[PDB]
């Protein structure tokens, strides 16, 4: 538990992820505030998203709870910031690092999955009117993901 979390934190400290920066809030080891930078060749370019991660007591035998904080216009992300992800439900094993989850979240930001969406209206717009979806996403990432 604590040793595994500290090992992950030390590994993150030694190697700067550049595109990511996760760390405990204040001095609490069971509440982290990770930072993600929007991909350049994506509608979310030039945006910073802050996520809250809460580790369960039985970590790593249980997946952590990850929630977005910055507003995002994505098919698989609800208003509450939830994430429609598989590795957090069943594929979770006591072998996946938080860095892998952050990389997966970056990939999900890179390309959505409208086939099994979480926000049906956004998915419908994505499948029907791609340009309107792009414009709305850019407007949102400029209004919310900057400053």
């Amino acid at each position: 538990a604590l040793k595994r979390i500290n090992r992950e934190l030390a590994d993150l400290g030694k190697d700067p992820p550049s595109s990511s920066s996760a760390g405990p809030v204040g001095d609490d080891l069971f509440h982290w505030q990770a930072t993600i930078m929007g991909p350049a060749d994506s509608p979310y370019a030039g945006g910073v998203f802050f996520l809250s991660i809460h580790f369960p007591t039985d970590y790593p035998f249980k997946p952590p709870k990850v929630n977005f904080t910055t507003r995002i216009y994505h098919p698989n992300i609800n208003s509450n910031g939830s994430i429609c992800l598989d590795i957090l439900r069943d594929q979770w094993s006591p072998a996946l690092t938080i860095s892998k989850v952050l990389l997966s979240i970056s990939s999900l930001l890179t390309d959505p999955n409208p086939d099994d969406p979480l926000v049906p209206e956004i998915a419908h717009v994505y499948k029907t009117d791609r340009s309107r979806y792009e414009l709305s996403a850019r407007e949102w990432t400029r209004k919310y993901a900057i400053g």
């Binding site: 604590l2 030390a10 405990p24 080891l29 086939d115 099994d116 049906p120 209206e121």
Partner: protein, 985 residues
């Protein structure tokens, strides 16, 4: 006619048909000693039609060694006459009687006959009649640490359920014309060849929906074959398969016939040569009793042992048994012939009561036929056991002293136990301790803590409570009841009402924990088990864990410095469904139940909380604007629940219920279908509503339908309760009001400055000021499954059924809805009795202070199949630290309250290890990757001061130790695990 308010937990184990057939059976019980009375208690709680007792023997003092319904004022009275009055109060639906004399013909009046404390000749005479007349005959006996059970249900017993598992069901993707059936993706049917299944809700093959059983050919973990379905169709789309179970015919043999050729059941596979010994030994006991005017051999007597062994030799020769008798074990049985323990009595009573239920319900697989059990490893060896010390002393503990002696009685009488929880297992454990006399000496004590209150549903298996006790604290009732059972425990019991957890450390501190002798868990959640395990590890105290699940049960023993802790044996976690599945794409009734639960919470709980907080917090709106994820949602909820949609009578509540029905079952489905039409395809060209996705269909409100009316009634009742109005149930008013309702037009919408801020301000300025409404509060609807008149389960059932109708899913009745939504754990009284017996049998091992790990046993059992197993505890893992052997669990470092720099220097010097991380709970005190300035600022502080500064919380005055977790690297740079640090403040 089944009382679902009392047998709520038992119905999930037995069923409606099982209990209905059980409530028509009469049970006669011959013998009313501890085992007999325990069996009677379990049967009465079970719910049989009636119970008849027969025991004319006058009471004696030693008979109180295990009979908890006898008092010293009852000496000289027949046991049945003084037991019937106390037994009749356990359950109001189970009459209890007493018969003065027993004629053979009278036996025709009963359905089951249980026999204890009867000679072999009388047992044979009774069985020779109860066999050919098709009456169940069960004979039980308990001699010291040995027990025997015999079952005989006739030669043509029909058993319906053979394993206790529900029939295997699954959802079918499609079936070809060759009988090949495949489940959905990554779904295992789990069936085997030769099984029978039935199909329902299959599209394209309606004929297969009739349900006629068909053969099963397992073609793989995900596919199987049923045969030829050419005639009925060519291809079947979707559908559900359900296992079909066929009854089995089991033929028992009578006692007279089974004496010569017995059929044994082995309770443990490491020692399978004992039961042949016990079969002879018990018969020898009966013969010796017949040879000495019914007087059993005196305790630890050599002459009587020799005579008993002679009887054993004669009987073995007579019955042509080609087994070489073991003199040691047989003479051991001779020594304990007059013994009478309460743990063995409880264990065998639970088992035999389960057998009676099997006989009555024609369910589960019964014993076939002999079951001989022994716990001889529990006999103490650190005290003096002989004929001089084991002689009776004329006290109520003679039945135990005759096995253990006075020295072990003193050892027991000075215990200081701690029982956590007061559930069924807690009550049974307390009863056993009261009977054994645990902590009745000068230095003894008992403490029991539990924070729950007695409910009606708890009365089915907690026999220390009564209907007049509903609503009171469990600990008080248990303490008073056990003081009444054993007057010597007056003032020797302390009952708390506190939840054992991190917040109770102010009461259960070091002073409390340093005087205990053992800790016994009776909890039902893993969190408390883990916390208690950590506390025991810190204080090094023996622990007794026990758990049940329906008819399965397990018991574990943790001994300091000897075995591993319970946390290392953590169970797999629970299951949760993807949010995307629950929100939009359900495919099972569980999904709809979870969705209905969320709907309930979001309708009657959260808006109410927001409104109340707005009318309580002076600065609620501003905080919620910049705190809530959807401040607009909060503001709209407040506006709707204050001004826009504030009901004035019940008619408005009905109108609101109709509006909510349309909004949740007609408009949302239309919007979802608009986003994803029924003909939509994926990015790969595959159809969308295929496989795990089912196309929903909007529902039109039909008042005459039952489910719609139920939903309307439930929603109106909950809304009125929220607003504190008066509900009504006559259909006339509902029909009148809902007749004149005009649904507002709705069509799916595609969408397509500071107006938003101005919209929020417009919402806000419409809200009445908090001062205008002072003292006006709305009552949220807190979910409560146990109350049947709060319309909670009704609402969940109605909503789940409606959503199932949306997605063409099979609705479930109120029974299954209550089972799933409330996460009710099935429980039985027999399982409780068995687990209590096992725990109390391990307790005497703990008292003796046995050191070897082969002397302890963790037990597991399943009564649906008559399975019992015992395995040695796992030894604590060891490790190498600084070239020394260290126990991973039971080791710690004890250090004073020194500064951080001194601690680091000590670890660098004494242990030769470099500290890289130091934390205290959930706070990071020190790390090797922190900036130098912060470290230099933190080094000269003492640990207590550092913890207070970092945690922003002063240490409590009662704190006397700190548990620090340290990760340190070796000299080479290799991480090495070390035990925790116990800083002594």
């Amino acid at each position: 006619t089944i009382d679902e308010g009392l047998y709520s937990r038992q119905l999930y184990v037995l069923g409606h048909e099982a209990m209905k057939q059980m409530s028509q059976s009469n049970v006669l019980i011959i013998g009313c000693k501890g085992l007999g009375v325990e069996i009677a208690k379990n049967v009465c709680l079970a719910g049989v039609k009636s119970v008849t007792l027969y025991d004319p023997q006058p009471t004696r003092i030693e008979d109180l060694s295990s009979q908890y319904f006898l008092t010293e004022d009852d000496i000289g009275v027949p046991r049945a006459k003084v037991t019937v009055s106390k037994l009749a109060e356990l359950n109001q639906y189970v009459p209890v009687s007493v018969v003065d004399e027993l004629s053979t013909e009278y036996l025709k009046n009963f359905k089951c006959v249980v026999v204890t404390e009867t000679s072999l000749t009388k047992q044979l005479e009774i069985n020779d009649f109860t066999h050919k007349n098709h009456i169940a005959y069960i004979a039980a006996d308990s001699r010291g640490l040995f027990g025997s059970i015999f079952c005989d249900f006739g030669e043509n017993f029909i058993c319906t359920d053979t394993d206790g598992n529900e029939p295997l069901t699954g959802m079918i993707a499609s079936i070809t014309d060759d009988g090949v059936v495949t489940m959905l993706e990554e779904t295992r049917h789990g069936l085997e060849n030769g099984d029978f299944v039935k199909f329902t809700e299959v599209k394209g093959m309606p004929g297969l929906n009739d349900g006629t059983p068909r053969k099963v050919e397992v073609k793989g973990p995900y596919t199987f074959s049923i045969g030829s379905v050419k005639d009925l169709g060519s291809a079947g789309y979707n559908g559900v398969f359900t296992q079909v179970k066929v009854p089995t015919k089991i033929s028992f043999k009578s006692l007279r016939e089974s004496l010569k050729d017995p059929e044994y059941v082995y309770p443990d596979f490491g020692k399978m040569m004992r039961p042949p010994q016990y079969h002879i030994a018990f018969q020898a006991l009966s013969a010796f009793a017949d040879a000495h005017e019914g007087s059993l051999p005196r305790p630890r007597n050599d002459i009587d042992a020799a005579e008993f062994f002679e009887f054993c030799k004669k009987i073995a020769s007579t019955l042509q048994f080609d087994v070489e008798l073991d003199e040691k074990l047989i003479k051991e049985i001779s020594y304990q012939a007059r013994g009478d323990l309460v743990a063995m009595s409880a264990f065998l009573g639970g088992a035999v009561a389960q057998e009676v239920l099997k006989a009555t319900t024609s369910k589960f697989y019964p014993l076939k036929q002999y079951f001989y059990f022994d716990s001889l490893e529990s006999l103490p060896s650190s005290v003096t056991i002989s004929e001089e010390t084991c002689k009776p002393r004329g006290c109520r503990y003679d039945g135990q002293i005759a096995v253990f002696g006075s020295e072990f009685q003193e050892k027991i009488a000075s215990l200081s136990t701690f029982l956590v929880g007061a559930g069924a297992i807690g009550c049974e454990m307390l009863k056993n301790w009261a009977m054994m006399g645990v902590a009745t000496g000068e230095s003894g004590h008992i403490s029991v803590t539990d924070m729950d209150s007695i409910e009606k549903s708890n009365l089915n298996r907690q026999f220390l409570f009564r209907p007049r006790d509903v609503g009171k604290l469990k600990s008080e009732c248990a303490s008073t009841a056990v003081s009444i059972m054993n007057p010597s425990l007056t003032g020797k019991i302390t009952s708390y009402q506190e939840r054992v957890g991190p917040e109770s450390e102010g009461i259960f501190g070091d002073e409390f924990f340093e005087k205990l002798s053992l800790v016994t868990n009776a909890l039902d959640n893993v969190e408390a088990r883990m916390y208690v395990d950590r506390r025991c590890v810190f204080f090094e105290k023996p622990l007794l864990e026990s758990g049940t699940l329906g008819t399965k049960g397990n018991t574990q023993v943790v001994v300091p410095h000897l075995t591993e802790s319970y946390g290392s044996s953590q169970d797999p976690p629970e299951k949760s469904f993807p949010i995307c599945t629950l929100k939009n794409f359900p495919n099972r009734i569980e999904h709809t139940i979870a969705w209905a639960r969320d709907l309930f919470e979001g309708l009657f709980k959260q808006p109410i909380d927001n409104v109340n907080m707005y009318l309580s917090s002076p600065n609620f709106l501003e905080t919620s604007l910049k705190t809530s994820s959807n401040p607009r949602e909060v503001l709209e909820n407040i506006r709707d629940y204050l001004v826009t949609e504030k009901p004035l009578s019940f008619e408005e509540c009905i109108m609101w219920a109709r509006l909510q029905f349309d909004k949740f079952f007609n408009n949302n489905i239309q919007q979802l279908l608009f986003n994803f039409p029924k003909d939509s395809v994926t990015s790969t060209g595959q159809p969308f509503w295929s496989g795990p996705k089912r196309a929903p269909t909007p529902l039109s409100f039909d008042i005459h339908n039952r489910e719609h009316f139920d939903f309307i009634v439930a929603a109106a009742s909950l809304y009125a309760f929220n607003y504190g109005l008066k509900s009504e149930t006559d259909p006339a008013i509902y029909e009148r009001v809902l007749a004149g309702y005009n649904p507002p037009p709705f069509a799916p919408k595609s969408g397509i400055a500071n107006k938003d801020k101005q919209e929020l301000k417009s919402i806000a300025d419409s809200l009445p000021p908090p001062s205008s409404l002072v003292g006006f509060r709305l009552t949220p609807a807190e979910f409560e499954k146990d109350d049947d008149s709060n319309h909670h389960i009704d609402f969940i059932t109605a909503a789940s059924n409606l959503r199932a109708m949306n997605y063409d899913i099979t609705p479930a009745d109120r029974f299954k809805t209550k089972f799933v939504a409330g996460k009710i754990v099935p429980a039985m009284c027999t399982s409780t009795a068995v687990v209590s017996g096992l725990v109390c049998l391990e307790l005497v091992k703990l008292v003796d202070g046995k050191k070897k790990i082969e002397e302890y046993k963790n037990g597991f059992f399943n009564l649906a199949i008559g399975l019992f197993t015992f395995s040695d505890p796992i030894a604590s893992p060891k490790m190498k630290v600084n070239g020394k052997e260290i126990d991973k669990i039971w080791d710690r470092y004890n250090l004073p309250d020194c500064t951080l720099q001194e601690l680091i220097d000590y670890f660098q010097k004494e242990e030769g290890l470099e500290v890289t991380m130091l934390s205290s709970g959930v706070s990071l005190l020190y790390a090797n990757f922190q900036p130098p300035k912060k470290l230099a600022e933190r080094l000269p502080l003492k640990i207590s001061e550092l913890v207070e500064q970092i945690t922003k919380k002063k240490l409590e005055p009662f704190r006397k130790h700190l548990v620090l977790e340290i990760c340190c690297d070796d000299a080479n740079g290799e991480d090495v695990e070390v035990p925790f640090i116990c800083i002594k403040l």
